[PDB]
Amino acid sequence: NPLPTRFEVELEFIQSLANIQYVTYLLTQQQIWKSPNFKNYLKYLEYWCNPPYSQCIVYPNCLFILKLLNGFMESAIVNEDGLLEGLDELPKIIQLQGPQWMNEMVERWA
Amino acid sequence: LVTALEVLSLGRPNLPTHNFKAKVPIGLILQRLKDLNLTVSIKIALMNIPKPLNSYHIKNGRIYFTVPNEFEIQLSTVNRQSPLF
Amino acid sequence: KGAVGPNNFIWPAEDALRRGMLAMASLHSKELTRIP
Amino acid sequence: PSYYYYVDPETTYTYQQPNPLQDLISVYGLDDISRQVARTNLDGTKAVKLRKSYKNQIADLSGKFSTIPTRENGKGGQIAHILFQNNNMSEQQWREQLRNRDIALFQPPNFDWDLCSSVLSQFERSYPSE
Amino acid sequence: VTPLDELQWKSPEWIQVFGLRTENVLDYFAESPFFDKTSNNQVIKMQRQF
Amino acid sequence: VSSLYPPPPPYVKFFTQSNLEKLPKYKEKEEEITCALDYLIPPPMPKNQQYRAFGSIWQVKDQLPDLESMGLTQLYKNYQYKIQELRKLLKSLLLNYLELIGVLSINPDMYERKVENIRTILVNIHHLLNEYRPHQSRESLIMLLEEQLEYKRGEIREIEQVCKQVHDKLTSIQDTLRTGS
Amino acid sequence: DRLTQLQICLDQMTEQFCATLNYIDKNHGFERLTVNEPQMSDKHATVVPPEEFSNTIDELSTDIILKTRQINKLIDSLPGVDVSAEEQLRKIDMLQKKLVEVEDEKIEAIKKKEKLLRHVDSLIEDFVDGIANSKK
């Protein structure tokens, strides 16, 4: 029973972004959007945009959500205290437009 | 093939976007201003002109009806069949 | 189209994330992080 | 000819054993039951309609029987489960203690007839009847 | 600590394996933290298992 | 009694501003991790070319499995042979249904082998369709290119017919100007 | 889409086998092996007239045959049966080259259209300023 690999763990996490109940759960925790670690991780996960990494993406709306979440990251500013400013209204956006986004991607499914 | 092309072209499937993730072409602005000059000039040909209002300056998306040392009023039309504004 | 759901087609569902191996990566986070 | 898949000429199927196309009553010889409790005689006429209760099989006794002993009259009891309970020497020898294995409930101290006589001697006259 | 009156609970492993209908709400609920292990339902479940 | 969703990967703790600023000088100079900045590099593709995700096995270049490899019977295996085999399989399925009705009409106790034959005929039909599926996908791509070409040529035709309408209307005003001259 | 209709037709046609077996198992009746044996039935069995029973059997069989006809015709009209993947790629590259060529054809067609655009632009502007100077 092998140990997990970085490719497989990062693939599962990047694909979980299609589940936007899951990113609602992630972005309703105060220690995640405030941390610049998550900002830098979501900027790092842009290697799934390009092939051969993009071939393994089974749920490409995760890539859509990844680009949408990284749209706020260049407008993010980290301060000396570690508070990632400009990110207080992102959970507002996610909780307001979550049902709408998943309804639109279900319509794209149909 | 639709989803394959979207992902392998833009890196994203094509979904509606409400937040940042347009741009109006300035050459198109120049072309529309030239044809708007042509539109006001194609409109004023069908209309009679007052004798003191024969001085009209034809540039810059509009027409300059001027009476010297009195006034200069500038007007634009949207199309052929709509009156001037 | 009344007995099939969008649960594991558009996105990975909750049970997919549980039985998936990011979940056990969370448990084995110490072994995955190791630096010599 | 053209071969088609799993259509095998050498594979053969037989009828069911027994065949339900036939009258299995006649196959296993249940004709005696069928003609003994058939609702109609097998010549086109109607047979006699047998009665719902067991008057015909209790009519051959000389007794006080005028009604039907049923479940609902309060005179009978549910003895079905007690009715249904269950438990060198040659074959013959083994069989007389098989015949004698139950006689132990017949003599005293189980069924002392002196005590039976003593309790039956306490009976007085008449019975209260409504 | 999160108090019990303030959380939503589901077991989608149980949903994938057994599936929830009207006949299994009680032993689906038995896996929840809402369920008390010292309850008459669980002890008569052990009695009927015995 | 834990949370519903798994947390983000522990790799998130490595992505700091200092690590990002030391990453490009590291770039100038299933992995053998040598430092903390190796997690800032995207991981390679799987060497086995199989990866595990969501409790399942996936392959980087998936291939259609065979009946023998999955433990079933493949009767028979440039697609005209497959199309005639599909016709033969359809006719065999219809004949097997008729034989199943006959077996049910005389003795419904050897129905198991006939149901098994219908089961394997149907999976053979479906597997032949799945073998033909890449060919139909490539036909769909050809159809996409042909429909793009059709729209392109329709735009050519409409643009040139607008242009020729301009030419002959200018010829008309030229003719009426000659008449009125 | 054509293979999709083929898979749909196979699933529905096997469901037609299932439904035919359902009807023939549930809606049959009772018949005489001999005339002497009694005939009877209950309220729990769907007794049907034998003539329309045979009619429904016949129309179920015609539905099975007709579905087989649609499946056979759909197999015959599956898209692409004689070309191999090499001819598919030899179609793919000529299709992309013709797409590029017709896009270039659109480039010069639009060049001619813009030539006509500025030609009629000059014509109408000369006309309007000439008639405006004449009317003034």
The secondary structure of chain A as a DSSP string is -PPP-HHHHHHHHHHTTS-TTHHHHHHTSHHHHSSHHHHHHHHHGGGGGSTTTGGG-S-THHHHHHHHHHTTTTT-EE-SSS-EET-SSHHHHHHHHHHHHHHHHHHHH-
Query: Distance from F140 to chain A by nearest Cα, in Å?
Result: 19
Residues of D with CB under 8 A from a CB of F: 4-7, 13-16
Phi, psi of A47 (to 5 degrees): -75, -15
> With contact defined as beta carbons under 8 Å apart, do A63 and B11 qualify?
yes
| Of the candidates B80, B42, B78, B79, the residue with the CA atom closest to the CA atom of residue B58 | B42
| Alpha-carbon span A62 to A19, nearest angstrom | 7
> With contact defined as beta carbons under 8 Å apart, do F36 and F42 qualify?
no
E8 touches chain C (CB under 8 A): no
CA distances from G106 to A86, C33, F166, G93 (A): 47, 57, 18, 20
Number of H-type helices and E-type strands within chain D: 6, 0
| Alpha-carbon span C34 to C24, nearest angstrom | 16
Q: DSSP alpha helices (H): ranges in D1-130?
A: 24-27, 31-36, 55-58, 80-84, 91-99, 113-120
Collapsing DSSP states into helix, strand and coil, what is residue F96?
Answer: helix
CA distances from E8 to A28, A98, A102, G62 (A): 15, 19, 21, 55
> With contact defined as beta carbons under 8 Å apart, do F124 and F75 qualify?
yes
Residues 6+ apart with CB under 8 A from A107: none
Q: Annotate G46-56 with b (16+ C-beta within 10 A) or e (fewer).
A: eeeeeeebeee
| Alpha-carbon span F73 to F67, nearest angstrom | 6
Collapsing DSSP states into helix, strand and coil, what is residue G118?
Answer: helix
CA G99 to chain CA centroid, Å, is: 27
Q: Which residue has the tokens 């329309």?
A: G52
| Of the candidates C27, B20, E8, C33, the residue with the CA atom closest to the CA atom of residue A25 | E8
Query: Distance from A20 to chain C by nearest Cα, in Å?
Result: 8
Which subunits sit against C, judged by 3+ Cβ pairs under 8 A? A, E, F
Give the H or E element holding residue F128.
helix F111-180
Give the H or E element holding residue B66.
strand B62-67
CA D125 to chain CA centroid, Å, is: 40
| Of the candidates C36, F50, F19, F35, the residue with the CA atom closest to the CA atom of residue A11 | F50
| Alpha-carbon span G83 to B52, nearest angstrom | 80
CA distances from E47 to E36, E41, E50, G1 (A): 17, 10, 5, 58
| Alpha-carbon span G14 to F93, nearest angstrom | 10
Look up residue E41 and give its two tokens. 């339902």
Q: Which residue has the tokens 């700091």?
A: F16
Mutation target among D4, D19, D22, D23 for the G interface, most CBs of G within 10 A: D23
Measured from the Cβ of residue E14, the count of other Cβ atoms closer than 10 Å reads 15
F 124-143 near B (Cβ less than 8 A): 137, 140-141
All residues of chain A having their beta carbon less than 8 Å from the beta carbon of residue C32 are: 3-4, 6, 9
Residues 6+ apart with CB under 8 A from E26: E41
Instruction: For F76, name the nearest residue in chain D, comparing CA atoms only.
Output: D5
Task: Please give the span between the terminal C-alpha atoms of chain A, in angstroms, as a whole number.
Answer: 39
Query: Distance from G136 to chain F by nearest Cα, in Å?
Result: 23
The sign of the torsion formed by the CA atoms of G87, G89, G95, G97 equals negative
CA G122 to chain CA centroid, Å, is: 53
> With contact defined as beta carbons under 8 Å apart, do D97 and D88 qualify?
no
C 1-30 near E (Cβ less than 8 A): 13-15, 18-19
| Alpha-carbon span A69 to A43, nearest angstrom | 9
Give the H or E element holding residue F50.
strand F50-52
| Alpha-carbon span B57 to B40, nearest angstrom | 11
Q: Annotate B35-74 with b (16+ C-beta within 10 A) or e (fewer).
A: ebbebbbbbbbeeeeeeeeeebebeeebbebbeeeeeeee
| Of the candidates G48, G30, G28, the residue with the CA atom closest to the CA atom of residue G40 | G30
| Alpha-carbon span F106 to F127, nearest angstrom | 33
CA distances from F174 to B31, F161, F177, F180, G126 (A): 28, 19, 5, 10, 16
| Of the candidates B44, B40, B68, B37, the residue with the CA atom closest to the CA atom of residue B55 | B68
Extended strands (E) in chain D: none
| Alpha-carbon span C16 to A16, nearest angstrom | 9
Instruction: Specify the resolution in Å.
Output: 3.0
Measured from the Cβ of residue F46, the count of other Cβ atoms closer than 10 Å reads 18
* Bridge partners of residue G5, in order along the sequence: none
> With contact defined as beta carbons under 8 Å apart, do A5 and C25 qualify?
no
* Bridge partners of residue F50, in order along the sequence: F59
Residue D91 half-sphere exposure toward CB, CA atoms < 13 A: 0
Phi, psi of C10 (to 5 degrees): -85, -40
Collapsing DSSP states into helix, strand and coil, what is residue B26?
Answer: helix
* Bridge partners of residue B73, in order along the sequence: B65
Residues 6+ apart with CB under 8 A from G120: F166, F170
Look up residue A43 and give its two tokens. 């900027």
CA D108 to chain CA centroid, Å, is: 33
| Alpha-carbon span F38 to F32, nearest angstrom | 9
Phi, psi of A85 (to 5 degrees): -70, 160
* Bridge partners of residue B56, in order along the sequence: B65
* Bridge partners of residue B65, in order along the sequence: B56, B73
| Of the candidates F53, B13, F52, the residue with the CA atom closest to the CA atom of residue A60 | B13
| Of the candidates F139, F42, F142, the residue with the CA atom closest to the CA atom of residue G4 | F139
Under an 8 A CB cutoff, do D16 and F75 touch?
no
| Of the candidates A23, A28, A41, A44, the residue with the CA atom closest to the CA atom of residue A91 | A28
| Of the candidates B62, B71, B66, B37, the residue with the CA atom closest to the CA atom of residue B49 | B66
| Of the candidates G73, G6, G25, the residue with the CA atom closest to the CA atom of residue F122 | G6
Query: Distance from F144 to chain A by nearest Cα, in Å?
Result: 19
In angstroms and rounded to an integer, the radius of gyration of the C-alpha atoms of chain B is 22
Under an 8 A CB cutoff, do G136 and B54 touch?
yes
Give the H or E element holding residue B75.
strand B71-75
CA distances from B15 to A48, A101, A102 (A): 18, 9, 11
> With contact defined as beta carbons under 8 Å apart, do C14 and A24 qualify?
no
